[PDB]
Amino acid sequence: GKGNSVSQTAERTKYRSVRRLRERFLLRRERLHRVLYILNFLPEHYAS
Amino acid sequence: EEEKDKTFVRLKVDRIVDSGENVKGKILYDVYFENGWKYDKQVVKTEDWVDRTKEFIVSESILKNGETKRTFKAVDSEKDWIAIKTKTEQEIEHSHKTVGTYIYETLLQNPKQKIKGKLVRTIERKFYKEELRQILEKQKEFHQELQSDDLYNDCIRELYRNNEVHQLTLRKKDFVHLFMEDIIFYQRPLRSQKSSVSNCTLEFRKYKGENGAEHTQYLKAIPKSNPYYQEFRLWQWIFNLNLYTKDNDENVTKVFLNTTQDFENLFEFLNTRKEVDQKALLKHFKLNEKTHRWNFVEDKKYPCNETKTMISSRLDKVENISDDFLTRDIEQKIWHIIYSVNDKVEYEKALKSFARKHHLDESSFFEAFRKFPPFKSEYGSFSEKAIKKLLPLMRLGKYWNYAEIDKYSRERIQKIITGEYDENIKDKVREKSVHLTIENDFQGLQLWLAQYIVYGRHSEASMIGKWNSANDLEVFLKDFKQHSLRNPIVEQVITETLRVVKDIWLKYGNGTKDFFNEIHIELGDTRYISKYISGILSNIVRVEDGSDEGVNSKNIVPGNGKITTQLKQDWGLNDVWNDLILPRFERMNQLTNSKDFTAWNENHQ
RNA sequence: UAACAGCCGAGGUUGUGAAUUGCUUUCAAAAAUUUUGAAAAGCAAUUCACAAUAAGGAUUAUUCCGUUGUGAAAACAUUCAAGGCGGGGCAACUCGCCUU
Numbered sequence: 001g002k003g004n005s006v007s008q009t010a011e012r013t014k015y016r017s018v019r020r021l022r023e024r025f026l027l028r029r030e031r032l033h034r035v036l037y038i039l040n041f042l043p044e045h046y047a048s
Numbered sequence: 049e050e051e052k053d054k055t056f057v058r059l060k061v062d063r064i065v066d067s068g069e070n071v072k073g074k075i076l077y078d079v080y081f082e083n084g085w086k087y088d089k090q091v092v093k094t095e096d097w098v099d100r101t102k103e104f105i106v107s108e109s110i111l112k113n114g115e116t117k118r119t120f121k122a123v124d125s126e127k128d129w130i131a132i133k134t135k136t137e138q139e140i141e142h143s144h145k146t147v148g149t150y151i152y153e154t155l156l157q158n159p160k161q162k163i164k165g166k167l168v169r170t171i172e173r174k175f176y177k178e179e180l181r182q183i184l185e186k187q188k189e190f191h192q193e194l195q196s197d198d199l200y201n202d203c204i205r206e207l208y209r210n211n212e213v214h215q216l217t218l219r220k221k222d223f224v225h226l227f228m229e230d231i232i233f234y235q236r237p238l239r240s241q242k243s244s245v246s247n248c249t250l251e252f253r254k255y256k257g258e259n260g261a262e263h264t265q266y267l268k269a270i271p272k273s274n275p276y277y278q279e280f281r282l283w284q285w286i287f288n289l290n291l292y293t294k295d296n297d298e299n300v301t302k303v304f305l306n307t308t309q310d311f312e313n314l315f316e317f318l319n320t321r322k323e324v325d326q327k328a329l330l331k332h333f334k335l336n337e338k339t340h341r342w343n344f345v346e347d348k349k350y351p352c353n354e355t356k357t358m359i360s361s362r363l364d365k366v367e368n369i370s371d372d373f374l375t376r377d378i379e380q381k382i383w384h385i386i387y388s389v390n391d392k393v394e395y396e397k398a399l400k401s402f403a404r405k406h407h408l409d410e411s412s413f414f415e416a417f418r419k420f421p422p423f424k425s426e427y428g429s430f431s432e433k434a435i436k437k438l439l440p441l442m443r444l445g446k447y448w449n450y451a452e453i454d455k456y457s458r459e460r461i462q463k464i465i466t467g468e469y470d471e472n473i474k475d476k477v478r479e480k481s482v483h484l485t486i487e488n489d490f491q492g493l494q495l496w497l498a499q500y501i502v503y504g505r506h507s508e509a510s511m512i513g514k515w516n517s518a519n520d521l522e523v524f525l526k527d528f529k530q531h532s533l534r535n536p537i538v539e540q541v542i543t544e545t546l547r548v549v550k551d552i553w554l555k556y557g558n559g560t561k562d563f564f565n566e567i568h569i570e571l572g573d574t575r576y577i578s579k580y581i582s583g584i585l586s587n588i589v590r591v592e593d594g595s596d597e598g599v600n601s602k603n604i605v606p607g608n609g610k611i612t613t614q615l616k617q618d619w620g621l622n623d624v625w626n627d628l629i630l631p632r633f634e635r636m637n638q639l640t641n642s643k644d645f646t647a648w649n650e651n652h653q
Numbered sequence: 654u655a656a657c658a659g660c661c662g663a664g665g666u667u668g669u670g671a672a673u674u675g676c677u678u679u680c681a682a683a684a685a686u687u688u689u690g691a692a693a694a695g696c697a698a699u700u701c702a703c704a705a706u707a708a709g710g711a712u713u714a715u716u717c718c719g720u721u722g723u724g725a726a727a728a729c730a731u732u733c734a735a736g737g738c739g740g741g742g743c744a745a746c747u748c749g750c751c752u753u
Contacts, residue, residue: 001573003535003654003655006535006537007656007721008536008720008721008722009536009656009658009721009722010657011721012720012721013657013658013659015707015720016718016720017661018706019706019707019718019719020659020660020717021660022705022706023716024660024661027713027716028231028232030713031715032231032232034203034206034207034713035203035207035226035231040193129663132663155700155701159700160700161700162700162701164663164664165665169662169663169664207715208714208745209713210714211714211715212745213744213745213746214715214744214745216743216744216745218743231715234715235660236715237660237747239659239660240747241659242747242748243658243732244658253752254753255734255752255753256753257735258734262753265734265753271749274749383749384740384741384749385740385741385748388740388741388747388748389740389747389748390747390748391741391747393742394741394742395741395742398741398742400742401740401742402740402741432750433751436750525723526723528722528723529730529731530730531656531657533656535656539722540722543722
């Protein structure tokens with residue numbers, strides 16, 4: 001009668017967006033690791 | 049605005065002098081602060097305003113008069129996201145230190161203070177950008193590796209081995225740019241939303257695909273900000289204008305607007321403005337408010353091709369140029385430059401390039417065009433192809449030309465002025481277009497006549513539609529597109545209705561067409577589904593002889609609550625329902641150990 | 654008014670390490686069954702750093718799929734052509750125009 005996120009697709013999109021943000025953060029971290037390793041800035045055990 | 053103050057401060061009210069605003073039997077006061085500020089809105093209850101520390105986010109705007117127009121808005125500490133954001137912003141700002149340094153200092157003062165989620169939750173990304181740049185440019189001196197080039201090529205190659213272009217582009221930057229603008233703070237632009245734009249209903253293209261067939265691609269809708277569409281709408285409004293007077297309320301039109309010169313003058317006058325209204329339209333004819341009107345709302349304004357006027361205003365503000373730089377090509381190119389490039393820095397680059405290519409000074413043109421408002425998200429019904437085809441027909445005077453018309457419309461006009469018979473010409477055409485005796489009479493045309501002249505179809509008459517069996521209904525169900533309604537509930541209800549009618553036809557018709565004779569629909573927020581379901585179900589029991597024609601079949605007879613309840617009470621169905629539902633009621637009586645759930649009546653005994 | 658879809662933010666939770674201090678038990682000693690002590694474990698509190706955040710499956714593009722709908726094909730819908738008249742930035746990419 002009023003409507004407040006009254007749809008299954010809405011919550012599906014919400015979950016998808018959250019997952020997408022998480023994956024973007026993980027990709028950024030991966031690229032940072034690769035750059036720091038090729039520059040040799042990380043500690044030995046961490047890079048191991 | 050250059051200020052964007054939005055400053056969060058906590059102020060205590062000193063006194064509340066009575067402002068003498070007696071509304072609904074209560075006199076309102078004002079608000080005075082120590083700094084010398086007053087709340088713009090009035091105050092009624094004094095219990096929550098006397099000598100209390102009230103905090104607001106205030107924005108100061110410099111008006112043309114020369115004084116700040118301070119705004120006030122109630123905010124609550126640690127409860128409002130914007131309030132917390134602004135408080136942390138100001139706390140970092142007046143320290144004149146980096147946000148990490150601010151967190152440090154807070155840790156120095158109180159080791160027990162929690163940082164994340166409480167001290168600094170939300171701030172602008174620019175603060176982190178500033179601190180991180182500062183630390184990288186500081187460390188770049190000490191570490192020679194941050195100034196090397198072999199490692200900077202190696203890391204670029206690692207990141208973009210399969211991208212030669214991005215490798216070559218980035219080979220010109222430093223490590224600071226990689227860490228800031230390519231890895232950490234890179235944020236992807238919005239995905240293009242043009243894929244959902246509606247299709248033109250007039251222009252089609254036919255092509256042979258890889259599947260050994262020949263099918264049609266549609267044309268995307270023209271943006272409503274297109275100068276062609278703006279001109280088309282302005283021409284439509286100017287031609288549709290009919291005037292009325294105030295004394296005898298007669299149709300004074302066709303007297304002050306009879307020749308082509310008056311319409312040409314009206315168009316040229318409306319080009320120089322952005323929005324026509326009552327006063328401007330009346331003054332254009334030297335008329336007055338007290339004596340005449342324009343058949344429409346006396347206090348409403350309509351679009352008047354504001355893009356051209358805005359472009360002219362900006363190209364006059366740049367100055368140091370003649371009054372001949374702006375033309376139709378320049379207007380279209382400006383529209384393309386602004387609307388196509390939806391990114392700030394790339395918009396700046398495009399504006400600078402546009403100023404460079406033309407022999408104009410890029411001193412104030414860039415400043416005028418950098419604050420150009422992004423165009424509103426709206427698209428027309430048709431495309432630019434249809435408007436380009438149709439526009440020559442509508443214009444009158446020097447803007448009316450027979451040369452720009454394409455082959456098809458010209459041939460159709462020649463056929464309709466010749467009076468010969470074509471398979472695409474009906475008696476309706478000769479009835480409507482009997483006044484088009486000469487090719488010059490095609491002046492000041494309207495949308496419907498010009499549309500039929502161009503394409504050959506009179507408006508939208510639909511295709512009626514008849515389903516010969518459940519095969520058509522199941523094909524339509526299979527081809528039904530999801531999320532094609534207002535909400536999922538209605539679309540799923542309609543889909544299940546279609547499923548059940550398919551099943552019942554298959555069972556009780558046994559593959560025999562026209563088994564159903566009438567279908568009645570009852571609904572009982574949900575009102576919009578009636579027309580759609582009637583249109584869908586019309587395709588079954590429609591009568592093709594012509595005695596049943598229109599948007600909906602006459603066979604579909606909607607119901608209402610009145611007839612339902614009347615027939616249920618009169619035909620004994622209410623009694624049937626009551627006796628059918630009784631057993632739960634005497635069980636309820638038994639479990640309740642009371643007789644209140646069933647009441648005896650003597651009128652029915 | 655609403656659908657659909659996209660770019661991002663701050664928490665919270667479980668888990669690892671760490672700073673401080675707790676409750677219970679046992680090793681574990683002294684003292685008058687009881688008090689105190691070294692150590693270990695179990696369970697936590699406050700703060701910081703890090704991991705995971707639907708189970709899982711790809712990939713190395715600055716890419717993703719995983720809570721929607723149809724229905725037996727474990728198959729799909731939610732991407733879907735060819736060129737040309739071109740503009741936009743250091744370009745990738747994107748936005749206007751035309752014929753099959």
